[PDB]
Design a protein around this ligand. Structure first.
Ligand SMILES: [K+]
Ligand SMILES: [K+]
Ligand SMILES: [K+]
Ligand SMILES: [K+]
Ligand SMILES: [K+]
Ligand SMILES: [K+]
Ligand SMILES: [K+]
Ligand SMILES: [K+]
Ligand SMILES: [K+]
Ligand SMILES: [K+]
Ligand SMILES: [K+]
Ligand SMILES: [K+]
Ligand SMILES: [K+]
Ligand SMILES: [K+]
Ligand SMILES: [K+]
Ligand SMILES: [K+]
Ligand SMILES: [Mg+2]
Ligand SMILES: [Mg+2]
Ligand SMILES: [Mg+2]
Ligand SMILES: [Mg+2]
Ligand SMILES: [Mg+2]
Ligand SMILES: [Mg+2]
Ligand SMILES: [Mg+2]
Ligand SMILES: [Mg+2]
Ligand SMILES: [Mg+2]
Ligand SMILES: [Mg+2]
Ligand SMILES: [Mg+2]
Ligand SMILES: [Mg+2]
Ligand SMILES: [Mg+2]
Ligand SMILES: [Mg+2]
Ligand SMILES: [Mg+2]
Ligand SMILES: [Mg+2]
Ligand SMILES: [Mg+2]
Ligand SMILES: [Mg+2]
Ligand SMILES: [Mg+2]
Ligand SMILES: [Mg+2]
Ligand SMILES: [Mg+2]
Ligand SMILES: [Mg+2]
Ligand SMILES: [Mg+2]
Ligand SMILES: [Mg+2]
Ligand SMILES: [Mg+2]
Ligand SMILES: [Mg+2]
Ligand SMILES: [Mg+2]
Ligand SMILES: [Mg+2]
Ligand SMILES: [Mg+2]
Ligand SMILES: [Mg+2]
Ligand SMILES: [Mg+2]
Ligand SMILES: [Mg+2]
Ligand SMILES: [Mg+2]
Ligand SMILES: [Mg+2]
Ligand SMILES: [Mg+2]
Ligand SMILES: [Mg+2]
Ligand SMILES: [Mg+2]
Ligand SMILES: [Mg+2]
Ligand SMILES: [Mg+2]
Ligand SMILES: [Mg+2]
Ligand SMILES: [Mg+2]
Lengths: 235, 53
RNA sequence: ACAUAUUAUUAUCUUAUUAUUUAUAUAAUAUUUUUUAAUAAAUUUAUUAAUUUAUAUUUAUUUAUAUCAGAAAU
RNA sequence: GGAUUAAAACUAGAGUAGCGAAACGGAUUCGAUACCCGUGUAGUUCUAGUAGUAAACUAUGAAUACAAUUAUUUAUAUAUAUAUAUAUAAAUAAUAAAUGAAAAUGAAAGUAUUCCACCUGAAGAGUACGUUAGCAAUAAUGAAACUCAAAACAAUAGACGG
RNA sequence: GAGCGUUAAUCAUAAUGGUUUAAAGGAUCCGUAGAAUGAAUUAUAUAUUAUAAUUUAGAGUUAAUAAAAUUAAUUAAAGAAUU
RNA sequence: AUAAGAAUAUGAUGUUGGUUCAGAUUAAGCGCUAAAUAAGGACAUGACACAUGCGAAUCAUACGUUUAUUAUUGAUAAGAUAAUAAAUAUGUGGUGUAAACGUGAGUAAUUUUAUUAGGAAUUAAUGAACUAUAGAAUAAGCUAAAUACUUAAUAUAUAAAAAGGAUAUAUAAUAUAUUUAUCUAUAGUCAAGCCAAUAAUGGUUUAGGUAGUAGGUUUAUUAAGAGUUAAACCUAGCCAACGAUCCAUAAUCGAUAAUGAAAGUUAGAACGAUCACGUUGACUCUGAAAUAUAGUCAAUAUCUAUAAGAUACAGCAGUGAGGAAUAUUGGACAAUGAUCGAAAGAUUGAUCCAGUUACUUAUUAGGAU
């Protein structure tokens, strides 16, 4: 049959309807006693100009098409070259949109900081008026303004404590919950495995059919999936 | 797309029908011609042997 | 340095031959075509030599391109 | 392919104490274009460049896996009845095995794997010619003929040593 | 041995090699090609290769903690001595 | 599967390292020497120049031409006609020389070689010349005549042909029969064109090369693809340090020869395959195929007939030259082939034999006492 080769497109878009394909064949080199790969670039006809640099293609022998062209593209085995072209165009649009959004979020942050620098009022001073007015009874209009600078309509000892909250405090509680879950899951499964009877019951209670007839790994995974379905789904 | 001016498929294999090959190559004489001549008789014998072979 | 021989090349010069392509002929031949003599046969027809007519096939000269080779330069 | 690359050298502009090619003198010597002494120019210095060469040496390309000990430091860690002790790495020193022409190497010059550079008698020769690069000195690349049966390394025993 | 010798030639006769010290490590590193070499498991295939999925022992990224004050470039200073 | 080393360093030792030797061989030469026979080889050099003779002819059953005899005709013999037997290849025709033979100049590959269970454009109304089968073979002209040539007729969009001769018999030139030729068609056989992949010496102290160059589109040309050639218009490519381009050198190869344990290396004389060439260059004609050992023109050399002439030994033998060196100006067509012829036969320096030469191989070249 017609001689067919597999190769990588190494040049495209330089000649009209012609691409350069790199074909590698296996040969034996008697001198060094080693089976080597021999490489050759083929000028190949691309009637539809579909192939792109980087594509893996199969080329088939044809009639003479020019001084040096004797093969044509017969199939695109892998279209990595075509993918490269599509992803580059999308990237330009995708990145422009993201950069526009980030540029607007930077100017907004700058405006807020500039606005705050125009308000001579300071947190410490404001928190020293909400704690003196709340301990003296005075209600100068500054407080009403302070009830707008911060949004704190009510001036109580439990409102300054909520104006000065630090994110670290929230992190400290999320971390304790995370540690609890892991510790509970491990103790639960550890105990369950120690008692085969309580384990068999555990599985049946959660909806396993004849858990007794199961393997150690085929069933410990069920136990693990259940212990993690009784401490993460209920919570 | 295959190259313009080229056949997409390979030419069909030509299978020989031995009955048709024999009929066209070594066909039998259509009539039993009168080979009274010495040279006609020799030619008839040679043609018969060649056709048999 | 250089004096030699050999080969190659060319925006050059000259060029046999050939191919291809131009223009021209009161060009030749055949046929057609228009007439015209001479001759012949018969009692219009044929032939030959001319002229007119187109057609095909050649010829001479001519235009252009390429070309063995030689010259010059490298 | 690229970059960096001692000393000397070169192109400009500064600097110039000391040192110091050369040069001119003083000695030494049979002679002394030397060793020693004097006067001491370039250079040695700085700024901006050129150039890409050294015994540019561990005369030992880089990477990975692996193999028997000791000593000594260093680092990290651990412990305590708190200052040592116990661990794991690195470096260095001396070694086993192994390798080697041997001298020796010793975690490689061992056991293996991968990649690069390089060599094929001496002399001629890192010369000639050409080419490339540089302001230049030069640098890179780099032969052949002729001639010879030499030539070289480690080690051994001597002889000799101002 | 009806040849023998000699000259001219061909093949064989050590790389089942080497480069600290004998010819031979590139001044050094960076890195391109390499038709150079190169991890793990599983499944396919047309099979020491290809593809896919998965993995972290090579190679990297960012932090945390501890440690160290050297090497480049630049700027600003000090010192003994010399003439 | 078959793998050996030796001499030479050094005061001595070990090692590095070259040099040389032991083996086989030749397209061999030379020196000395030499018996017969059988077989295999023989200008590697100047693709230098060549005296002389040969190497391609054959057909009379294509057409003409020339005799003799006999018969008939011709009232005197010049001629004619037919039969018979001869002659003619200095007239017109046919077939044969694209092979074979010789040589290795050119050729490093758009061309050449080798290989592949390769390919398409998806290769002509090509048969070259045999086989099988079928059909056809007509009319004029031109020549002295024809199987010469020309123009027509009819034969698979349809296109595209031809030829008679010999011998008998019967007829009144014609017809049959036999024989040998001509033309067309279909298939077979033999045999052609084109393309791809892979391999094919040295120098980069030849590093850049290319400009129809790389690709696209269209026409011309061809049986047929393609910057293969020619014309037009576009794109800016293509090759290259895994060595481009350039230069030098060389015919290539094997189931051939030499050598080695082998991988290999060498040769390319001999046997065989392939290519190129026939003093040099280009071009054209015929043809399926030729830049043909043809033709045309030119170049170089020679010759005689002095013409827009002939010849060119790389066919055989042979000569001069060059060289260290390579043979007979032989016999035969008996054999195997080739060409011509219907046949009888003719031709064949293909070929087969012999000669010369230890160039190679082999056998023999007296045994017992
Ligand atoms: K084309
Ligand atoms: K490099
Ligand atoms: K100074
Ligand atoms: K050193
Ligand atoms: K290296
Ligand atoms: K060594
Ligand atoms: K000696
Ligand atoms: K030796
Ligand atoms: K001899
Ligand atoms: K005849
Ligand atoms: K000959
Ligand atoms: K040749
Ligand atoms: K007949
Ligand atoms: K080259
Ligand atoms: K010969
Ligand atoms: K014969
Ligand atoms: Mg010319
Ligand atoms: Mg200066
Ligand atoms: Mg001095
Ligand atoms: Mg520099
Ligand atoms: Mg130097
Ligand atoms: Mg050096
Ligand atoms: Mg140093
Ligand atoms: Mg590294
Ligand atoms: Mg130099
Ligand atoms: Mg020594
Ligand atoms: Mg003998
Ligand atoms: Mg060997
Ligand atoms: Mg090494
Ligand atoms: Mg080094
Ligand atoms: Mg060195
Ligand atoms: Mg890591
Ligand atoms: Mg010998
Ligand atoms: Mg003989
Ligand atoms: Mg010869
Ligand atoms: Mg006759
Ligand atoms: Mg004749
Ligand atoms: Mg021939
Ligand atoms: Mg007729
Ligand atoms: Mg006639
Ligand atoms: Mg004819
Ligand atoms: Mg005709
Ligand atoms: Mg040179
Ligand atoms: Mg074309
Ligand atoms: Mg071309
Ligand atoms: Mg053109
Ligand atoms: Mg030659
Ligand atoms: Mg060979
Ligand atoms: Mg050869
Ligand atoms: Mg011969
Ligand atoms: Mg020829
Ligand atoms: Mg010629
Ligand atoms: Mg000729
Ligand atoms: Mg000649
Ligand atoms: Mg001869
Ligand atoms: Mg002589
Ligand atoms: Mg003869």
């Amino acid at each position: 049959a017609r001689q067919n080769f597999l190769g990588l497109v190494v040049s495209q878009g330089k000649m009209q309807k012609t691409v350069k394909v790199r074909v590698e064949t296996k040969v034996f080199n008697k001198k060094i006693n080693k089976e080597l790969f021999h490489r050759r670039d083929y000028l190949v006809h691309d009637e539809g100009e579909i192939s792109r640099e980087g594509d893996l293609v199969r080329i088939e022998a044809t009639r003479p098409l020019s001084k040096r062209k004797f093969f044509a593209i017969a199939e695109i085995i892998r279209n990595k070259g075509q993918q490269f072209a599509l992803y580059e165009s999308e990237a330009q649009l995708s990145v422009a949109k993201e950069e526009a959004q980030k540029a607007k979020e930077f100017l907004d942050k700058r405006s807020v900081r500039e606005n705050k620098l125009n308000e001579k009022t300071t947190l410490l001073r404001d928190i020293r008026t909400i704690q003196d007015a709340l301990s003296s009874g005075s209600t100068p209009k500054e407080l009403l303004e302070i009830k707008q600078r911060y949004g704190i309509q009510d001036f109580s000892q439990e409102t300054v404590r909520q104006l000065l909250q630090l994110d670290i405090s929230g992190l400290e509680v999320n971390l304790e919950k995370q540690r609890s879950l892991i510790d509970r899951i491990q103790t639960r499964l550890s105990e369950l495995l120690s008692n085969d009877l309580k384990c068999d019951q555990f599985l049946k209670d959660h909806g396993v059919e004849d858990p007794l007839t199961l393997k150690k790994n085929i069933k410990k995974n069920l136990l693990r999936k259940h212990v993690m379905m009784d401490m993460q789904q209920p919570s | 797309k295959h190259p313009k001016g080229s056949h997409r498929l390979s030419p069909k294999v030509n299978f020989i029908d031995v009955d048709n090959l024999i009929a066209k190559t070594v066909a039998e004489p259509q009539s039993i011609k009168s080979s009274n001549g010495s040279a006609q008789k020799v030619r008839l014998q040679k043609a018969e042997l060649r056709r048999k072979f």
